[PDB]
């Protein structure tokens, strides 16, 4: 969920957008419909999941589908936001799946209902998980917001219907993200099958520190990243567009 999902988008940004410009225009509405229905269907499907892994795997699908809306909307805002949200997802999904991995490597459940009300027992992991699922919300000041809002802006430069459905994607994305957060870290504990369990040791508390600093650096000051790409993105969008 960190690299392989980028091959399709990067391949679109390299060997599909430039070489076939008018084909991209002719196939633009079809991609919009596919991405919008993917966002909506995945959002509605992921809110009734009990598997501890698929719950965010579908979030990854939703984010990747939302990427293509502005990736195929030929625009400096759209493509720039596309890569920014791509990096943001590559960080946030990685962090979420590491959290799921550490949760699974202690208890070995792969369920969601077993865990509950463990904030009184693992407060550090609670804060880290809150920050990660908080970035998944696309808060301004977090990684996902700048890129994702740039995608919305770029698509609304071209079209006014489909990316409104993209924005409607986040009316439920944030909802089920916090609901999922509240399955596990909230409520009273159930010490019927949670006898003994520990918190993050020195390794996995330091492993998130690069994630935290990269996330905040994305959120508060993404100018350095946009600085190095505005030439390439603008060259990409204007190729085969003489006028």
């Amino acid at each position: 969920a960190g690299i392989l999902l980028k091959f399709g988008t990067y391949g679109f940004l390299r060997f599909s957008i430039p070489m076939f410009p008018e084909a991209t225009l002719c196939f633009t509405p079809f991609i919009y419909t596919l991405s919008a229905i993917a966002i909506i269907y995945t959002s509605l499907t992921t809110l009734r999941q009990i598997d501890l892994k698929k719950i965010i795997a579908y979030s990854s699908v939703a984010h990747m589908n939302l990427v293509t809306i502005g990736m195929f909307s030929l625009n400096i805002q759209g493509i720039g936001g596309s890569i920014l949200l791509m990096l943001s997802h590559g960080l946030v999904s990685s962090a979420l799946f590491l959290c799921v991995g550490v949760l699974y490597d202690r208890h070995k459940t792969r369920l969601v209902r077993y865990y509950g009300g463990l904030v009184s027992t693992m407060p550090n992991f609670s804060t880290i998980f809150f920050f990660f699922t908080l970035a998944n919300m696309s808060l301004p000041g977090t990684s996902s917001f700048i890129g994702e809002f740039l995608i919305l802006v770029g698509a609304f430069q071209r079209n006014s219907l489909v990316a409104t459905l993209a924005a409607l994607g986040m009316i439920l994305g944030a909802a089920y993200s916090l609901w999922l957060y509240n399955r596990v870290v909230s409520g009273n504990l159930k010490p019927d099958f949670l006898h003994k369990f520990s918190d993050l040791n020195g390794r996995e508390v330091f492993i998130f520190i690069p994630f935290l600093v990269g996330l905040v650096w994305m959120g508060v000051y993404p100018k350095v990243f946009l600085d190095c790409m505005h030439t390439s993105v603008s060259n990409l969008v204007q190729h085969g567009k003489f006028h």
Partner: protein, 76 residues
């Protein structure tokens, strides 16, 4: 909290009340003051205030930019 005394509780356990918190409070105030001094220095360094005050305000004692934006043609 029978078991809650075993967790680290980064922001403080159920009822921590450490043995010496007043000294920690004092050093916390000192650190906040020390860290907000550069914030004040930066704030006084960047503040336009295009219009001159009607009466002498407690400003312009550390701020030197007053009436520096009534030249709205040489603006980048």
């Amino acid at each position: 909290g029978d078991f809650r005394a075993k967790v680290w509780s980064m922001t403080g356990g159920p009822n921590c009340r450490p043995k010496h918190w007043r000294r920690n409070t004092a050093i916390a105030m000192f650190g906040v003051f020390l860290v907000c001094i550069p914030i004040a220095k930066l704030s006084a360094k960047l503040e336009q205030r295009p219009h001159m005050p009607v009466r002498p305000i407690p400003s312009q004692i550390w701020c030197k930019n007053f009436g520096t934006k009534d030249d709205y043609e040489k603006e980048h």
